[PDB]
Symmetry: C2
Subunit: 191 residues, 2 copies
């Protein structure tokens, strides 16, 4: 609920802040040699059985949003994230809420080279959080299959830690991956 500015969200007192990031990379691959993958988007299965974007809570009195994100990404995704600088330019949006708890979440979006994502996936099994906070990394299917369900629509029927779905739908729009009509279709096909 509510799109707040970064600058205004940061000026608030007694709010709990969170940072999450969509890491992505272009791909020339085709599923079954016919269906283009287009782009690789990382999400993860969380300890709580829900899908989410990597990241977490940041205490903005101690460290910066970016520094907090950085530290959270390393724990969740592993060493490979020491070559990766998610900076202010990667920042995208911020939502604020007061119930259940005064919470602001920030959303980042960073493009990488395909092999970087691959190095990340290869090394995520060595992350401090593997098999604990993080139950596994997954790629988001951007395609719809011949049955009009399989792929993205079906994927959106999984269980998402509150708000991550909306962030994802935001990112599909912002990266020009899907038209508004296409997103609407994907949501109907899902239901």
């Amino acid at each position: 609920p509510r799109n707040i500015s970064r600058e205004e969200s940061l000026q608030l007192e007694g709010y709990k802040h969170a940072c999450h990031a969509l890491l992505h990379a272009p791909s020339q691959a085709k599923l079954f040699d016919r269906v283009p993958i287009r782009r690789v988007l990382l999400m993860m299965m969380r300890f709580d059985g829900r899908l989410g974007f990597p990241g977490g809570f940041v205490d903005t009195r101690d460290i910066s949003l970016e520094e907090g994100l950085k530290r959270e990404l390393e724990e969740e995704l592993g060493p490979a994230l020491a070559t990766v600088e998610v900076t202010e330019d990667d920042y995208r949006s911020s939502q604020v809420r007061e119930h259940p708890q005064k919470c602001v979440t920030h959303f980042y979006i960073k493009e990488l080279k395909l092999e970087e994502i691959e190095r990340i996936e290869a090394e995520a099994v060595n992350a401090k959080d593997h098999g604990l906070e993080v139950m596994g990394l997954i790629r988001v299917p951007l395609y719809t299959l011949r049955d009009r369900v399989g792929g993205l629509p079906a994927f959106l029927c999984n269980n998402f830690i509150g708000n991550s779905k909306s962030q994802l739908l935001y990112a599909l729009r912002s990266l020009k991956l899907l038209r508004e009509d296409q997103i609407q279709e994907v949501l109907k096909a899902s239901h």
Copy 2:
């Protein structure tokens, strides 16, 4: 949709055969140093956006042999040493609401390190980023809120009947009693 025998299946006309496996290993690890993992159970995100177990379609070789082939393709080269024998066979179902289909479910215990190596090398499998969008571990615990963990996990999208197969494994491996399973299901669909 319907329970069946291995011999009533393998001697059926028409129908296409499928094999999937739960690979699992014990674990002493603790979430937030508090909540026991108990056991590591592999599943995966499929290309179709659904969760399922690794495996697939088998007049060919044999149920064990096909499963091995699919597991190698989907999990990587590490699998070639995993036994996956008749001793690891468990059950068979018959559906007909999407062409005559027989699913054969397998459960095999490995060593934790074996599961770990499987995860690490899965990214080099033929099917990584194609048929296989990533491996996951099944959370077996339930968090303070009485939803997070297994109950919330059961609200994800499962490819036909894999959920049923999972719930069986929880009973079969004595991880949860019947009432416990019904509790997580009640919490899940609530």
